Amino acid sequence: TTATMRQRWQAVMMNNYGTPPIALASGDGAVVTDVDGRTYIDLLGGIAVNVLGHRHPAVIEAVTRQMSTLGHTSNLYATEPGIALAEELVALLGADQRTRVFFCNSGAEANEAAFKLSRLTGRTKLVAAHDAFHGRTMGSLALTGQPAKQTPFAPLPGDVTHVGYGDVDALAAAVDDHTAAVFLEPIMGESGVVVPPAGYLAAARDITARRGALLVLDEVQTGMGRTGAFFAHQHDGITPDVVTLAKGLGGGLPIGACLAVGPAAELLTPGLHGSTFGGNPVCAAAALAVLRVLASDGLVRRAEVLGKSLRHGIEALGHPLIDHVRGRGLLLGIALTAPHAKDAEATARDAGYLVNAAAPDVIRLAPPLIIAEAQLDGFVAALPAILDRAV
Amino acid sequence: TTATMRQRWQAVMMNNYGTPPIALASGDGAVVTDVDGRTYIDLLGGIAVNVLGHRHPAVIEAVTRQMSTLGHTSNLYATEPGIALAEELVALLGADQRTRVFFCNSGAEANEAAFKLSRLTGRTKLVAAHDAFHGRTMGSLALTGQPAKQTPFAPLPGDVTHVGYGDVDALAAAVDDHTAAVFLEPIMGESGVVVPPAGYLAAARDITARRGALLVLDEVQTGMGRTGAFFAHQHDGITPDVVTLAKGLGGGLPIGACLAVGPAAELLTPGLHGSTFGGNPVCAAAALAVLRVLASDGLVRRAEVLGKSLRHGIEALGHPLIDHVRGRGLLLGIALTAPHAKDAEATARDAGYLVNAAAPDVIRLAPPLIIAEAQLDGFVAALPAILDRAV
């Protein structure tokens, strides 16, 4: 029962998440089932992680095969899956300079690695955006632009200046010859799928290049083909110095990566960084399977097509509570005219849909890339009643 | 071939580990095979991670079953494996006060969670030991007591004082009413399996309790029954305020945990910390399987028996390069009379044994808890020739 599972959670878990309102028992594709047998269409993917949904045969087969071959070894030893995964990720980034890879376990750890690279430039000043989310460990939390989540743990690693997201002249004013790096999400996810103005990431590339700062693009949530290009920044024709990845990288298996291009790729020398589980064969095998499936099933182009039809379908409802839809591909925010997103998350759950109130007035969607068109169709048709019940 | 795998590594990986000398292809139990067909007895366990060796059927069964049931969901939803794992870990700690659990992906992240708990006490001073290792993210690196790995990333989060490990008077002098927490390994692993004097951990518990400081015991390397108790600190009959775990916790799958006891368990409130992959069903299922096998096969008590036989056998060699043997259970250090541990690591490798030069003069062993005594006996019989060749 849901109450027994919730009571067990409240007896033993730290309360840093609050208590989950539902307890899930199984999942298959984009459908999850709770402990009472109710099914839900998953439009959130565990917060953009389950790019291939649950029980994807290719991920299961890769993990099962690798566990029956060779498990964890540590990076005292070279192993095939991590090397192959690094080769594939470098090919997908497609930079015209030498690109090198560091594996870790999470998005916070990937940005901690990028934080450390920044230190090796000889500079200690960092710039990030207000409301950005880059992780919750002490270094990545310093980059995260959320004072209410940072103040309790101060002092944090320095020296970080935050600027308004998308504001070209604010960024230019904050970046100088002392700036080690600028961190940016190509779309701010956790804040409410906030899309920057047209030339903004290109401006960030030019500002950082002229001042000798690294440009670090955090693709933890925007990557893995979700926006219709493998990396969201590839829509903008720029090459950052560092890119970080996690969430969907392993199809659900914990893995993150920090890629560095050109001189940045050479900063880390032996003994200066590491992670015990980083690059382990089982999680790397899972990530390799995700990449294979994205390519063989054309899921990156499918995200662009479905995201475009989903945005138009929502906008065509003409619902007075919907101000606009934003995002790209299958990362979408439904921006509301009044702050009812939390209520709409609950009434959507009543209607059998899992969504996210990312902000008081924004519903975030990040469905599996394997989502059925009819599963999206049903959500759009149900949305007016979801919103009417919310208000 | 090994040469081809090393070339592929050098073309794509960042150089933070150097280039591994061995490329592994497969593993089974405590025997691994490299890409050239050479076999090795694994006395290091991927750095204390592979508590059950490779291809353990209980871990394979748990992971395959859980992947075919429910993968990642995020902590927006309650799921059974993480709740059950938290229940089992709390039972194993055996504290008399309420204990709560936070899951994450690594030992660094576990200590980052403990660092953040320390901040919520309203104090910002931290104490750790010289030569301690607590992780490489910015917060855990501040606690790590290794200047050459810290100074390139300065400034690190404050305010940490390091004291000599095992020195009661130095610790008493460093801990005052502004000290948020003391972090200690019960045996320093990375440093060279440095065992503290009798009574030290009990003194640390008394010092911290009197001064209002948290005692955080880092059991990432000493836990999972390796020393003959589930937590190494249980040998000394103390209960810390916070315990961190990782490495062997998942039998190879990436998972870590921060356990907090009594008032420390209530410091984290909703919204103040999190990790996307934390507590996910697949890794938690793996860890549950490890705990089941430890219990069903009596591997904790077995680690004590094998560690004593191993220690006695090494001491009985009377080899002039061996100064003493230290450690507990299956975390063992061979302290040498001259700094030839790196050479001995290589000659052990020539003889088909994987060991670790943890310091210039210490060979560290952390074999799978399923290692056969016969495999240990064979290493002892080979050690005189290994050490002769080393010098």
Whether B148 sits inside 8 A of A271 (CB atoms) is yes
Distance from C-alpha of B185 to C-alpha of B187, rounded to nearest angstrom: 5
A96 in any annotated domain: yes
When divided into structural domains, chain A yields a total of 1
Whether A282 sits inside 8 A of B252 (CB atoms) is yes
Whether B138 sits inside 8 A of A139 (CB atoms) is yes
What are the two backbone dihedrals, phi and then psi, of residue A103, each rounded to the nearest 5 degrees? -95, 150
Nearest to B70 among A27, A59, A251 (CB): A27
Task: Report the residue of chain A nearest B356, measured CA to CA.
Answer: A76
Tell whether B108 is in a known binding site.
Answer: yes
Per the CB < 8 A criterion, the answer to whether B270 and A19 are in contact is no
Interface test with A, best of B14, B245, B253 (most A CBs within 10 A): B14
Residue A4 exposed, middle or buried by CB count within 10 Å (0-12, 13-18, 19+) = exposed
Domain co-membership, B260 together with B375: no
Peptide linkage before B81 cis (omega within 30 of 0)? no
Burial B240-260 (b: 16+ CB within 10 A, else e): bbbbbbbbbbbbbbbbbbbbb
SS3 A134: coil
Per the CB < 8 A criterion, the answer to whether A253 and B282 are in contact is yes
Size of interface A-B (CB pairs under 8 A): 334
What are the two backbone dihedrals, phi and then psi, of residue B192, each rounded to the nearest 5 degrees? 130, 35
Distance from C-alpha of B9 to C-alpha of B27, rounded to nearest angstrom: 20
Closest among A371, A337, A365, A342 to A187, alpha carbons compared: A365
Whether A252 sits inside 8 A of B282 (CB atoms) is yes
Whether B47 sits inside 8 A of A276 (CB atoms) is yes
User: Which of B296, B331, B355 is the endpoint of a domain?
Assistant: B296
What are the DSSP calls for B300-338, one per residue?
A: HHHHHHHHHHHHHHHHHH--TTEEEEEEETTEEEEEESS
Residue B267 exposed, middle or buried by CB count within 10 Å (0-12, 13-18, 19+) = buried
With beta carbons under 8 A apart, name residues in chain A contacting B272.
16, 149, 152
A241 in any annotated domain: yes
With beta carbons under 8 A apart, name residues in chain A contacting B283.
254
| C-alpha pair distances (Å), B336 with each of A203, B353, B359 | 58, 18, 10
Enumerate residues 101 to 120 of chain B having a beta carbon within 8 A of any beta carbon in chain A.
101-102, 104-109, 112, 115-116, 119-120
Whether B277 sits inside 8 A of A105 (CB atoms) is yes
What single-letter DSSP state applies at residue B195? P
Token code pair at residue B286: 């793996």
Per the CB < 8 A criterion, the answer to whether B234 and B275 are in contact is no
Whether B138 sits inside 8 A of A112 (CB atoms) is yes
Is residue A31 less than 8 Å (CB to CB) from chain B?
A: no
A315 in any annotated domain: no
| C-alpha pair distances (Å), A236 with each of A186, A204, A262, A328, B367 | 10, 11, 19, 13, 50
Token code pair at residue B364: 């560290």
Tell whether B107 is in a known binding site.
Answer: yes
Is residue A382 less than 8 Å (CB to CB) from chain B?
A: no
Distance from C-alpha of A56 to C-alpha of A370, rounded to nearest angstrom: 10
Whether B356 sits inside 8 A of A282 (CB atoms) is no
| Beta sheet of B331-336, edge-to-edge order | B322-328, B331-336, B362-365, B356-359
Whether B18 sits inside 8 A of A271 (CB atoms) is yes
Burial B284-318 (b: 16+ CB within 10 A, else e): bbbbbbbbebbeeeebbebbbebbeebbebbeeee
Domain co-membership, B227 together with B337: no
Is residue B73 less than 8 Å (CB to CB) from chain A?
A: yes
A9 in any annotated domain: no
Tell whether B275 is in a known binding site.
Answer: yes
Per the CB < 8 A criterion, the answer to whether B175 and B168 are in contact is no
Distance from C-alpha of A353 to C-alpha of A350, rounded to nearest angstrom: 7
Domain co-membership, B67 together with B198: yes
Nearest to A13 among B100, B137, B282 (CB): B100
Is residue A270 less than 8 Å (CB to CB) from chain B?
A: yes
SS3 B361: coil
User: Which of B277, B296, B315 is the endpoint of a domain?
Assistant: B296
What single-letter DSSP state applies at residue A333? E
Distance from C-alpha of B9 to C-alpha of B5, rounded to nearest angstrom: 6
Enumerate residues 274 to 303 of chain A having a beta carbon within 8 A of any beta carbon in chain B.
274-277, 280, 282-283
Distance, in angstroms, between A69 CA and closest chain B CA? 5
Is residue B254 less than 8 Å (CB to CB) from chain A?
A: yes
Resolution in A: 1.7
Whether B75 sits inside 8 A of A17 (CB atoms) is yes
Distance from C-alpha of A150 to C-alpha of A130, rounded to nearest angstrom: 12
SS3 B248: helix
Domain co-membership, B198 together with B92: yes
Domain co-membership, B246 together with B353: no
With beta carbons under 8 A apart, name residues in chain A contacting B119.
152-154
Distance, in angstroms, between A325 CA and closest chain B CA? 24
Distance from C-alpha of B272 to C-alpha of A158, rounded to nearest angstrom: 20
CATH of the domain at B10: 3.90.1150.10
Distance from C-alpha of B285 to C-alpha of B34, rounded to nearest angstrom: 29
Nearest to A100 among B12, B50, B60 (CB): B12
Distance from C-alpha of B284 to C-alpha of A68, rounded to nearest angstrom: 19
Q: What residues pair up with B217 in beta bridges, in sequence order? A: B184, B243
- Continuous segment of H or E residues that includes residue B47: helix B45-48
Quote the domain boundaries for residue A233. 74-296
With beta carbons under 8 A apart, name residues in chain B contacting A108.
109, 112, 137, 275
Domain co-membership, B230 together with B91: yes
Distance from C-alpha of A2 to C-alpha of A22, rounded to nearest angstrom: 6
Tell whether A133 is in a known binding site.
Answer: yes
Whether A60 sits inside 8 A of B55 (CB atoms) is no
Domain co-membership, B206 together with B317: no
What are the two backbone dihedrals, phi and then psi, of residue A369, each rounded to the nearest 5 degrees? -70, -10
- Enzyme catalytic residues of A: 133, 218, 247
A288 in any annotated domain: yes
User: Which of B296, B312, B346 is the endpoint of a domain?
Assistant: B296
Tell whether B133 is in a known binding site.
Answer: yes
Distance from C-alpha of B69 to C-alpha of B79, rounded to nearest angstrom: 11
End-to-end CA distance of chain A: 29
Domain co-membership, B245 together with B324: no
Is residue B59 less than 8 Å (CB to CB) from chain A?
A: yes
SS3 B357: strand
Method: X-ray
A142 in any annotated domain: yes
With beta carbons under 8 A apart, name residues in chain A contacting B277.
49, 105-106, 254
| C-alpha pair distances (Å), B157 with each of B117, B254, B281 | 14, 26, 33
Contacts of A93 (CB under 8 A, 6+ apart): A99, A230, A231, A243, A259, A261
Domain co-membership, B50 together with B67: no
Distance, in angstroms, between B199 CA and closest chain A CA? 31
With beta carbons under 8 A apart, name residues in chain A contacting B253.
72, 282
Domain co-membership, B271 together with B336: no
| C-alpha pair distances (Å), B318 with each of B37, B315, B378, B383 | 34, 6, 16, 11
Per the CB < 8 A criterion, the answer to whether B245 and B259 are in contact is yes
CATH of the domain at B72: 3.40.640.10
Domain co-membership, B283 together with B349: no
Tell whether A276 is in a known binding site.
Answer: yes
Number of separate helices (H) and strands (E) present in chain B: 13, 15
Nearest to B139 among A25, A138, A158 (CB): A138
Per the CB < 8 A criterion, the answer to whether B259 and B93 are in contact is yes
